[PDB]
Amino acid sequence: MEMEKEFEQIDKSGSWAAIYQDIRHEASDFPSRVAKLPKNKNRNRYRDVSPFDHSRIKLHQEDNDYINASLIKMEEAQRSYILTQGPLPNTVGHFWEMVWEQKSRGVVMLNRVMEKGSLKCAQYWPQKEEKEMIFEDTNLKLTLISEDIKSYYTVRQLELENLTTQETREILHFHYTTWPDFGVPESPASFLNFLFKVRESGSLSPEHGPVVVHCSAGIGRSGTFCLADTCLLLMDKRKDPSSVDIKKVLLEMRKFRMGLIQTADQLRFSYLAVIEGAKFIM
Numbered sequence: 001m002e003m004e005k006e007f008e009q010i011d012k013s014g015s016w017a018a019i020y021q022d023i024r025h026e027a028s029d030f031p032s033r034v035a036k037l038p039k040n041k042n043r044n045r046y047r048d049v050s051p052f053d054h055s056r057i058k059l060h061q062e063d064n065d066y067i068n069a070s071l072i073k074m075e076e077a078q079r080s081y082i083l084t085q086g087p088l089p090n091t092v093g094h095f096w097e098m099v100w101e102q103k104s105r106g107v108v109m110l111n112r113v114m115e116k117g118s119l120k121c122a123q124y125w126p127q128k129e130e131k132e133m134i135f136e137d138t139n140l141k142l143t144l145i146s147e148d149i150k151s152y153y154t155v156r157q158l159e160l161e162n163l164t165t166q167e168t169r170e171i172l173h174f175h176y177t178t179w180p181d182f183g184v185p186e187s188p189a190s191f192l193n194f195l196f197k198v199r200e201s202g203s204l205s206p207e208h209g210p211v212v213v214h215c216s217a218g219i220g221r222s223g224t225f226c227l228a229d230t231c232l233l234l235m236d237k238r239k240d241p242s243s244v245d246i247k248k249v250l251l252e253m254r255k256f257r258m259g260l261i262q263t264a265d266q267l268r269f270s271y272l273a274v275i276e277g278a279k280f281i282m
């Protein structure tokens with residue numbers, strides 16, 4: 001079926017939970033043996049969210065190459081994404097090592113450091129120009145260059161230096177700051193505006209390594225971001241845009257990381273975002 005009318009048909013019939021459970025039943029199951037090794041317990045935020053072995057990002061280190069991060073490679077859309085958890089106190093250095101080694105231009109953050117009174121990820125970037133951060137375990141230096149605070153999101157320019165080679169690179173930090181503590185946003189308008197700002201920066205384009213996108217577990221909000229982006233790109237590429245099937249795209253993405261889209265409300269919100277976004281594109 002088309003999307004907008006399939007949408008109204010699920011609303012009128014109140015069957016979002018049943019649609020979402022079908023997706024959960026059909027989703028791929030692949031091994032994640034490296035994630036479950038005992039030496040990696042303090043590298044995982046949640047025991048039930050792990051990268052598959054076949055698609056995990058490897059750190060370029062011989063001691064321990066593990067990080068909780070997955071490469072989502074979308075062949076028809078010609079887009080790639082790295083989806084990862086919010087960094088932990090003992091993985092902030094690994095996080096920036098990955099950004100460096102994978103040649104990413106942008107980092108997309110969809111959570112606040114504290115939500116619901118609890119810490120959802122480490123304070124992993126510097127908050128003042130004159131107070132830079134040094135990650136001694138991976139030999140990197142990170143400096144805040146500029147910050148632009150808007151009503152729904154903040155954009156930061158950062159300098160990442162590899163202290164071993166003295167090479168430097170400019171990294172863009174796109175921080176969506178207004179996702180509610182409970183539920184999903186009422187309108188997708190500010191989320192779509194944010195997606196378009198990431199696109200306009202070059203961070204999603206083939207001349208750079210894959211964008212790095214995270215929230216607390218790296219599957220829920222993060223899944224919503226890449227699902228909406230890929231669906232809208234496919235609607236621009238194909239002769240028949242009504243042929244784009246959001247449930248099929250989501251199942252393709254779940255071949256590369258488990259659990260993408262965590263609730264039926266997030267599924268409905270993803271439909272809403274793609275529907276409204278397709279009208280603005282034209």
Ligand SMILES: CCn1cc(C(=O)NCc2ccc(F)cc2)cn1
Pocket residue numbers: 155156157172200201202
């Ligand atoms: C009219 C001149 N102009 C150039 C840009 C530009 O560089 N856009 C890409 C970009 C986005 C966010 C960043 F932080 C840095 C770079 C915007 N206006």
